[PDB]
Every structure is written in structure tokens, then in C-alpha cells.
Design brief:
Shape of chain A: globular
Shape of chain B: globular
Helix content of chain B: 40-55%
Strand order of the largest sheet of chain B: 5-4-3-2-1-9-8-7-6
CATH architecture of the largest domain in chain A: 3-Layer(aba) Sandwich
CATH class of chain B: Alpha Beta
CATH architecture of chain B: Alpha-Beta Barrel
Entry title: wildtype tryptophan synthase complexed with glycerol phosphate
Distance between the termini of chain B: 26 Å
Chains A, C: tryptophan synthase beta chain
Number of domains of chain B: 1
Number of helices of chain A: 16
Oligomer: heterotetramer
Largest interface: A-C, 42 and 42 residues
Number of strands of chain A: 14
PDB class: lyase
Bound molecules: pyridoxal-5'-phosphate, SN-glycerol-3-phosphate, sodium ion
Keywords: lyase, pyridoxal phosphate, tryptophan biosynthesis
Strand content of chain B: 5-15%
Helix content of chain A: 40-55%
Assembly: tetrameric
Strand content of chain A: 15-25%
Radius of gyration of chain B: 17 Å
Order of helices and strands of chain A: EEHHEHEHEHEHHEHEHHEHEHEEHEHHEH
Distance between the termini of chain A: 54 Å
Structural class of chain B: alpha/beta
């Protein structure tokens, strides 16, 4: 029995071993209570404003759109403390952990951004943080690993399975299965078992709320579409949530197409995978024909979650949101274009979203359209990657 | 069929508990796993609990993570597991065979089709480790349509509503967890389980098999004395495989010695 | 003849070859005009707000000060676009360049942050940017050099002299001596010939203006002191300017003490150098006994300017501001402390300022004091440096 | 003393322009620089313009940047330069000797003390390259108290107020820049300088020496024809040093050939 519906249509649920169900029910109840609590809301807003730097800017990109009838704005989550939107929801989850009387945080991370985010929130709020990270990811993200440790978190390499994000996800759940009485699991995206998809959307929905107010101020109308990359689905649902009931506003999510969908080396399970049950939820998964879970491939390390949030699968099924994919070369081209024409270095994750906006503009340059791209993070971390390719 | 019911009746007539080993099918290869299983039965196993290799076994500690890695190195697939199961049933007509599965392997090609395949090969029960009672409806319904007992875990943090649900929905046996955490022989449960056991009997639940952390004879006799119908041991068995990979003959001898000892403790 | 006084007491002036004097007079007149122009002010404010992310947060650091009577706030220039305060004044200077009808930008850089800043502003505003950088600095700042080029600037290594910042400063002036009719020299600190000290302060003074309003809102009173690192003097004068007439507010500037003042391996010319004439101005310089200019040494690459802004030398001489120094090990300790206790990674430059605040707190823990440290930049760039030392 | 005035009078009597080479003192070593200077004079230099090595010569192109680097490799200091100057004056009693200095070397140990040292060794003039007229007051005053002519640059972008100031303040000669930019023989000035030259004479300025980019005889004769009193050549001379570092004897021969040619062009 739960307070809120754990499903978005057929997708979602609470597919964890029975021993973890009390922890999920406890978290759901704490969340419902926090959402009606003016003191919790004031505390969250204060950290968002005075620690993280909200509200973030909405930047118009006239150099990019010159000569066309596209007007494009970027929502500047690259300017949030930590360099990516993940900071919003780790602060709310840290506060939920304290509300429940927990003193320890467990988190998983792939590219490391979620681990840095979890470590910074835990340092600020006095929580003891341990992070699980696939050993292959530890090897290729030494900078992030060192940032986590400078912030006082313990980083534990995971060598099982493929030694990447999914295996860190498993290990986090194995730990929580034994430590839930003292530790909160600070999950990194809008996926996993209920209530996580719902809590992560609500702790990211200020992205879309601010965007709406900002665009109304600057243009006096809502966007024709809002566009966001989809790794696990958090930045995209945070941008989409406030516009879901605005039927005229398009919601476009962009999964990584890797080397190309036809090559099979991609990370686009929503449109090109198959529904399965893993990580606590029923959702589209990267998996073999026999049901073994597989990795997502992208030039961008952070779009590596091999499934997708159940709310996105639901919005897709009813046709409220549209999902597309962008390849590695398209993302690289968008990264180069933003640097040169606007002086902003975008994360290679966010570059997928910007690449799809550029295609909408270039393919029909005389179509009048007001677009917002969620610039989910900054790309200083990606310059070596981009340098080596080039 | 009613293999668990026949077993527990027989055992009750001898005032004995069940001893039930777990292994991962195909660890460390198909042929050796078949030999391992025959040895477990010859040495006194009353029933089997068997895993199908999966990419992400989130209820398992390192010992069983490694069994899965070994099975995957051998190329073991679910279809190969089903062929093994058919062969095990053809050799041994009465022993209860239960699967311990992860959800994605059951849901993959259709939940109903999974249970139908289990009935075709002779499996008696299925525990899906990452399906709690709250999500179990399609799994238990499909199990029952195909004469398969759906098994539920009764955790130490179980409340009364959960005990009633477990007792109502489960068949064959109830999986009584020794403790929180994941599988592993290193970590022994020490909580008193007497109350849960009595409550389950009060609610006419399937007989309880205690599992997680059972690695020694005294823990088998303790489980039976507390009122459980038996005990399951997996990591302890699997560790004997892992330590003897280089000597398959010595591996079977040690498995025999251990299962014999654990089974003697249930009498 | 000039419109504004080129001196702060004995310090400052316009010590350039005669051929550059028309360019300085032109710039001074354009600046005076821009400062009275509501359209220029609106345009500058719009870029600061909607492109750069102003206003920046003022963050209270209660974990750091626990157990003492210090209250400490950090002014969050680490959250400005580009990661450091330099972005404020390059945007204003880019706009002055366009106001004068110039289409090209020349800039110098040491650690590279000024070069990245100049490149981003020039990309946004359609200016062609060339950057001079000491070849020894090019070798040790490959990331920054690549960011400049991704943003479309031309980076030209300078091999003369010591092949570091001062030699890039010279080369920039040699170029402008021949190209001033089409190119504006976008100088990187509040130093050099008038009118640069004055323009750079006025294009950074929003740091102190926002701080004042923010502290009055949160505490209902002005700080007992505002504390800032001093490489060339821009972030510090931007923080100090609005408080100069508030006589109760202490102004403390922190130069790098390197390995220790007594070792001679430092970068503290204001308190430990000797007045000279170089880079267009009369100011305290790092120099030998015979008058040859020398380098500044610090663990932080960005506190490398071998002199200091003439306004700081003047504020020191009259005792309105106090200047101190912090060593490499003190800065490293402050960097570690902020990461672990507040989840913020500070630039090693800014860490000098924070280290001096920590000393003010620790040396007299029962003294009641309300302090603001200017957190001039983020320290993600410094993690390798810090990792290698440790 | 009035060495520039005596020179320009003599030259006017022969309808000749002055040819004035520049070198950096101590490039490429003290002894060789002294020999270079004696060769320049023997081959026909009418006056000398001499630089003191400085760490940051911001008015100089690469040729002179390199002369400074060479002098520093030889350990050349300002005090060593002053000793050289005294020695040059002791050998040559009438030739005008002008310094081209950077401000910090003049201000370092006191502006007055610098000019006093120049008077003690026999220097006739000083041009401080990074002191514009607007900042020149303490420099010109100190120069005049020590019988040193303060020299100012008249740039191509000079307005009337600047011409008047230059004419009023300067003594000895006026440095007429050929062009914008920094020193270097590669880049030749081509602007007509006739108007500036006439305006300076109208305002009774010190006689004009054209400098920057003068590297060939035809440019010497062109400067004299336009009305200048002569011409200065530095990078062209310094390049002969740089190209002949390995053969000091050949270096002096080529310097002789070049200065002789440039001086012939002024007649
Ligand atoms: C982690 C990350 C993403 C992907 O995660 P979502 O949950 O899909 O938002 C996207 N952009 C940035 C910058 C990230 O750090
Ligand atoms: C460049 C820089 C400084 C030093 O320059 P100032 O002109 O003294 O402010 C200080 N902090 C940061 C972060 C910088 O990038
Ligand atoms: O003995 P354990 O701890 O591995 O627990 C038993 C499980 O493997 C299987 O039921
Ligand atoms: O001949 P240039 O171009 O080096 O210019 C002359 C200066 O060196 C010295 O007066
Ligand atoms: Na995904
Ligand atoms: Na300095």
C-alpha cells in the first residue's frame, strides 16, 4: 500500500527484495510530509538560492540562430553550483535523509557527477557519504574521484559484472539492503523503485518553473518546445514537469545515439530497447534477447544509465512527449558550435539536446519557432575528450 | 504435482527437518554443475534451490556474484539452464526443485511463458528475489495456473499484514530470511525467529525454510528447534565450488562431506 | 590632459611610449561617455544578468566557524560564467571596444583564465580575439589554451624574456603600438596605464555593491571586514570599491607569500617589493636591485602578476586598506577545509583570501566578527595541483 | 657641453645629414660591444644611440629583444654599461652619445641620480622610451639640471599641441618616428613626414633625426631630402651582429661596410 501511485501507466513500480520495502514506504511518507511542510520548503529554497545559485539564467542565443526564424534560449544549469543540474535534487534528498533521522548517505555514480553532487551535499549538511562506482569508471574519472574524496566521501570501486554504472547501482542496493536503518540511498536519476522517480522530478521541477516564468517575462508566451537530453531522465523531467499541462508546449527528450542506432552501439532504450524489470522498476532497458542487462554507449559518459525513467516511457506512450536520438558526431558538432558562437562550453550530455535543436532549426530555417534547450551542465570536463577526438 | 507437500509429510514422519542446498546452474560449467547437483542429492539434500545466471544479481553477496561470473564465462544461458533442469528431473522424480530467479529473466519472454516452461521441465517452485508481495500478482497467478508454487520471503522486518499476505499467497514453502542484507556465508543471522515462525503457522503458511547465512550444522539444528521445517544453504556450498575449481574430483568429495554433515544435523 | 586623474596619490600614471597615448585618451573618453549612457548601462547589465549569471550568491559558512564568534560569508564569484570574477570586466571592456568601433581584441594571460574570459566575451559579441601567453605558461595550461581555441581566439606563444606573464604583457603592448586603430587591448587586471585601473574597478564594482545589499539583507549591518586575494588587484578592488566610504568596514587584501616572504620566493610586491615604473604605471614591483623586473612565485598560477594595481598601493599608503600575505601551505589548508566542510572547491587564488579569514578566526576565536571573503573563482582547475602535492 | 649643437652646425656647413647607429651596450659581450662601437665611429657614425639591457623592452621588435637576451647571457648590468660609456667617452671627445632607456632603469635608484651619472660619464642625451611628454616633467628637469638633453619622440599620430610640446621640451635632437609599431628593420615607414618636419622647424624644435625601420642608404637620403637632420638605424646594425656571432672579425668588417654606405648616403 502506498500514498502515491507507484506507476506511470504500465511503467514504474517497486521491484525490490521484500526487505527494502519498509525503507521505500518510510521514504515515500517522509517525502509526502516534507512537501506539505513550510519549514522544509523554506530550508530547501534557502539552500537552492544561497548555496547553489538559483535561479539560473535563461540565455538567448542570437548568434546561433542568425538567418533563421528560430529563437533559442538555453536554461543555464551549467551555472549551478557543481556545474550540472544534479545539485538541485541531491540537496532535497539530503534534507529528506535528515528529516527521517538518517546520518549516512549511499550513492551510485557512473561518470562521477552524481558522486560529486552527493559528496558536496553531504559535506554541507553533515552526513557521512559513501559512493559506489564501477571500477572501469573509477579508472576513467580520476578527477571526479579525487573531488569526492576532497569533500570527505568514501569512494568504493565495484568490480562485479561490467564494472560500470549498472553494477554500482546493484552494489548500492545490496548495501542499503543491510543498512537502511541508518543510511539513506541517494539515487542519481528519476528512475529506480517508487518513490524515486517522483521525488527526483519534484526536486528538479524548479528548472521548468523558472523557465516558464523567464520565457513569459522575455517573450510574453510559452515555448513551442523544450528540449532536454535523457540519460536516466532527471534534467529532462525537471524541465518538462511544469509544462506537462500546457498542451501547446512540445516536450522533446534526446537519448544518445552513440555510433548510430543501426550499429547497436547506442544508449537509446526508450525508443530502441525493450521493456524489462531491473533496478526496482519496469521500464525500457538495454538488454540482450535472453534478458541480460547491457550497457548504454555514448561519447558522453553521463548518458550511461542503461534504462530510462518510467515517467518518460509513460509520456512517450501517450504521445505527450516525443523522444529522438543524436549521435556522437552530432553532439560533438553542437559542442563546437556553442563554444565558438556563444562562448559557452556545454557538457557533452547537454550537447545532445542542443544538437537536436540545431537540427530543428537547420532542417526548416523558415519555420517560426521559440525553443528552449535545457543546458544541463558545463563542459570543461569534456575538453580532453573532445581534444583527443579532434 | 505436490512434491513439497509429500516431502514435508515424509520428513514430519521421521521428525526431521529439510536440508536444502543452493547452487547457481552451470557454475562452473554445465557438465560439472550437473555432477555437483547429483552429488548434493546423493549426499542427502532433501530439495534443491537453483539459480539462473543473471547479469545483475542484486540480492547476492560476492560468493554468489562470483558463481554467476563463472557461469557466464562458461557461456551459460537461461535456455541451457532449462535443459539442465529437464535432465535433473529425469534423473530424480520426487525431489522438490525450486528456482531462485531475478525478475527480468521471468518477465523477458512473457511471465506466463516462463511459468509454463518451468512446468514443462518439472520445476516445483519459483522465488523471484526482486518481486515483493506488493508486485507479485501476475507472478503468483501465472505460477498457480502452471502448478508451480510461488514462494515469498518473510523478512525479519515483517509486520503482521505482511505475515498474513505471505501466508495467504505462498505455496510449497515460505522463505524465512535469517537477517537483512544479501546472501553470504560470512554473515550469520542471530535474531530470534521463533515469533515469526509461530505467526506463520498460526496463519497456515507454507512450511518455513530458513535461509541466508546458514553455513554450519549447528545452524541447521537451531532452525529446526525454533520450529522451521528446514534450512537452505547456498554460499557455503558455492564456496566449496570456488575453492576447488582446479580439482573437480576433490570438489565433489568436499561437497559430499559438507552436505552429509548438514543433513545429519536436521535429524 | 585627461578627463579623470590618472594617479592614486603617487601611484599610477600613463607610462607608455608616445605613440599609444591617443589610444589611451580615446579609451578614457569612451569610458566616461559609456558611464553616463543609459543604453550602455542597460546592455552591460543585461549581459551580466542573462549571460553571466549575476547576481552571484552570498553563502554563509556555519560549518567552518562552529565554536567561534566569527560569522563568515563567501561572495560566490566561483558561480559566475567562466568560473571566476574576470568575466564581469571583459564583458564591459568588449562593449567599450564596440562603442569605439573596434572589431579586434588583444589580450594577455598568465594562468589562462583571462585568455578564456577574453575569448568568451569576444565570441559572444563578434570580436576577433588574439591572446598573448608566455610559452612556459602555454606548456602548463594546455586545458585553457584549448578552451581559448574552441572559442575561436588565436593564442600566440611568447618566447621572449622569461616566457611568462610579464613577457605576454610586453608583447600585447608591442602589438597594440602598431594596431590600435582597429584593435582594443583588453588588459586583464586593475593595473597598467590609466585609464585601465579605473575602468577595471568600475567594471568589477558590482561585486562589492551586491555584497553590501546582500549582507544588509541577511545581517542588517555592514561587514567588520571584506577580504580578497591580490594578484593584480581586480577582484579585490571590485569587492572593496563600494565599501571605501564606509569607514568602519575593514578592507584586507591578501598577496601570495609563496614559500615564505623570507625565502624571497613569493608574489607580494605591495608589502615586500619596491616601487618602479613598468607596464605603463608607477607601482610596487617584483624587481632586482638593479631594476630588472622579476616574476611573482605562488602555488597559484593566477596570482602571478609581478606588480599590483596602483589603487591598492594608494589605499595601503593612507591606511584605508591593509595588506597581508598567505603562504602556499596556508592556501592549501584553506582549500582542503572549504572542500570538506562546505562542499565548495575554491580556486587556489581565492584560497589565499579564505586562509587569512581562517587565521583571523582561529587566532582570536572569541572575537565577534562578521567577515566576507571574495571567493574569486572555482578550483576544479586546481585539483591535479593539489593532488600532486598531497 | 653642446655636442649635438656643434655637430649639427658642422654638418650643416657640409650640407650633410647625420647618420646615427643604435646598438645595445654589451651585445654580445662587453669587449666585443666596445669594439663594435669603435668600428661604427671609425666607419663614419656622426653620433651614437645606445641601449641599456632591460628585462622588458616593450618598444622593441625581435631583433632588439634578442640583443637584450644576448647581453643578459653575458651578465651585462647597468653599472657595467656606465663603465663602458665612460670608456667610450674617454676615446672619443666630441661625438654625441645618446641613451635610449626604459623608465624603470632611470627611476630605480632615483631619477636625479641617473642623470647625474650620465653627466659624470659624458652622455649627451637620454630618450626614455615609455615616458610620454605628459609624464616627462621629473625626467626633463633632472636632465637639464645635469646638462643632459631630454629627447622626445614625435610620432606620426602627433597633433599640433604635441608638436608644440615636443618642440618646447626637447633638446639636442627630436626623435622623429618613421611609423607606428616597435623597432625593426623588416618594417619600413612610408608615410610622408614633410609636414611634421616643417612644423617642428616652425616651432624651433631640436633638429629631427628620423628613426624606426631605417635599413638602407636610400632611406637615409630620403630622410635628409624631406628636411630631417639625419637618420638613426638600429635593428639593421644589430642584425649584422646577430648574423655574425660566430665570426667577430667578419662581424666588424660587415658593420664597417654598412655604416660606411649609410653615412655616404647622408652627404
Ligand atoms: C548526469 C547528467 C545528465 C544525465 O542524467 P539525467 O538524469 O538524464 O539528467 C545530463 N546532463 C548532465 C550535465 C549530467 O551531469
Ligand atoms: C585572475 C584571478 C585572480 C587574480 O587576479 P586579480 O586581478 O588580482 O583579481 C584571483 N582569483 C581568480 C579566481 C582569478 O581567476
Ligand atoms: O546461504 P546464503 O547466505 O547464500 O543464502 C541462501 C541463498 O543463496 C539461496 O537461497
Ligand atoms: O632601426 P630600428 O627600427 O631598430 O629603430 C631604431 C631604434 O632601435 C633605436 O633608436
Ligand atoms: Na538511458
Ligand atoms: Na601581484
Amino acid at each position: 500500500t502506498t500514498l502515491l501511485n507507484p506507476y506511470f501507466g504500465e511503467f514504474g513500480g517497486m521491484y525490490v527484495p521484500q526487505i527494502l520495502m519498509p525503507a521505500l514506504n518510510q521514504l515515500e511518507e517522509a517525502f509526502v510530509s516534507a512537501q506539505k511542510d513550510p519549514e522544509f520548503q523554506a530550508q530547501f529554497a534557502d539552500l537552492l538560492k544561497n548555496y547553489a545559485g538559483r535561479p539560473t539564467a535563461l540565455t538567448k542565443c542570437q548568434n546561433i540562430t542568425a538567418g533563421t526564424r528560430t529563437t533559442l534560449y538555453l536554461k543555464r544549469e551549467d551555472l549551478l553550483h557543481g556545474g550540472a543540474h544534479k545539485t538541485n535534487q541531491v540537496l532535497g534528498q539530503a534534507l529528506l535523509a535528515k528529516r527521517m533521522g538518517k546520518s549516512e548517505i549511499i550513492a551510485e555514480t557512473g561518470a562521477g557527477q552524481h558522486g560529486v553532487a552527493s559528496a558536496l551535499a553531504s559535506a554541507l549538511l553533515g552526513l557521512k557519504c559513501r559512493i559506489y562506482m564501477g571500477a572501469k569508471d573509477v579508472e576513467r574519472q580520476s578527477p571526479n574521484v579525487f573531488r569526492m574524496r576532497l569533500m570527505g566521501a568514501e569512494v568504493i570501486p565495484v568490480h562485479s559484472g561490467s564494472a560500470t554504472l549498472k553494477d554500482a547501482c546493484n552494489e548500492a542496493l545490496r548495501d542499503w539492503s543491510g543498512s537502511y536503518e541508518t543510511a539513506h540511498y541517494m539515487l542519481g536519476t528519476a528512475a529506480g523503485p517508487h518513490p524515486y522517480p517522483t521525488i527526483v522530478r519534484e526536486f528538479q521541477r524548479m528548472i521548468g518553473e523558472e523557465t516558464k516564468a523567464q520565457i513569459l517575462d522575455k517573450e510574453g508566451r510559452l515555448p513551442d518546445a523544450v528540449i532536454a537530453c535523457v540519460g536516466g531522465g532527471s534534467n529532462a523531467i525537471g524541465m518538462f514537469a511544469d509544462f506537462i499541462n500546457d498542451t501547446s508546449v512540445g516536450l522533446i527528450g534526446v537519448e544518445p545515439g552513440g555510433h548510430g542506432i543501426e550499429t547497436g552501439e547506442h544508449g537509446a532504450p526508450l525508443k530502441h530497447g525493450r521493456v524489462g524489470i531491473y533496478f526496482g522498476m519496469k521500464a525500457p532497458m538495454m538488454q540482450t534477447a535472453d534478458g541480460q542487462i547491457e550497457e548504454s554507449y555514448s561519447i558522453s559518459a553521463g548518458l550511461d544509465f542503461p534504462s530510462v525513467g518510467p515517467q518518460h516511457a509513460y509520456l512517450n506512450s501517450i504521445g505527450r512527449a516525443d523522444y529522438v536520438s543524436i549521435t556522437d558526431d552530432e553532439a560533438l558538432e553542437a559542442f563546437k558550435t556553442l563554444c565558438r558562437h556563444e562562448g559557452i562550453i556545454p557538457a557533452l550530455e547537454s550537447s545532445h539536446a542542443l544538437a537536436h535543436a540545431l537540427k530543428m532549426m537547420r532542417e526548416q530555417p523558415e519555420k517560426e519557432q521559440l525553443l528552449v534547450v535545457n543546458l544541463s551542465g558545463r563542459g570543461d570536463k569534456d575538453i580532453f575528450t573532445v581534444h583527443d577526438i579532434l | 504435482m505436490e512434491r513439497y507437500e509429500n516431502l514435508f509429510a515424509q520428513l514430519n514422519d521421521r521428525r526431521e527437518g529439510a536440508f536444502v542446498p543452493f547452487v547457481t546452474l552451470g557454475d562452473p560449467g554445465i557438465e560439472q554443475s550437473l555432477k555437483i547437483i547429483d552429488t548434493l542429492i546423493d549426499a542427502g539434500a532433501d530439495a534443491l534451490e537453483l539459480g539462473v545466471p543473471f547479469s545483475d544479481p542484486l540480492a547476492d553477496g560476492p560468493t554468489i556474484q562470483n558463481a554467476n561470473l563463472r557461469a557466464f564465462a562458461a557461456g551459460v544461458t537461461p535456455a541451457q539452464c532449462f535443459e539442465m533442469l529437464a535432465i535433473i528431473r529425469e534423473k530424480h522424480p520426487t525431489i522438490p526443485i525450486g528456482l531462485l530467479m531475478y525478475a527480468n529473466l521471468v518477465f523477458n519472454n512473457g511471465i506466463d511463458a516462463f511459468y509454463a516452461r518451468c512446468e514443462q521441465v518439472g520445476v516445483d517452485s519459483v522465488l523471484v528475489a526482486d518481486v515483493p508481495v506488493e508486485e507479485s500478482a501476475p507472478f503468483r497467478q501465472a505460477a498457480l495456473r502452471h502448478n508451480i508454487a510461488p514462494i515469498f520471503i518473510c523478512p525479519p522486518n515483517a509486520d503482521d499484514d505482511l505475515l498474513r499476505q505471505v501466508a495467504s499467497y505462498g505455496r510449497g514453502y515460505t522463505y524465512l530470511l535469517s537477517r537483512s542484507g544479501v546472501t553470504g556465508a560470512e554473515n550469520r543471522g542471530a535474531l530470534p525467529l521463533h515469533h515469526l515462525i509461530e505467526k506463520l503457522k498460526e496463519y497456515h503458511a507454507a512450511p518455513a525454510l530458513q535461509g541466508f547465512g546458514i553455513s554450519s550444522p549447528e545452524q541447521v539444528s537451531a532452525a529446526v528447534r525454533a520450529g522451521a521445517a528446514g534450512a537452505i544453504s547456498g554460499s557455503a556450498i558455492v564456496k566449496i565450488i570456488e575453492k576447488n575449481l582446479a580439482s573437480p574430483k576433490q570438489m565433489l568429495a568436499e561437497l559430499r562431506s559438507f552436505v552429509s554433515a548438514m543433513k545429519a544435523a536436521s535429524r
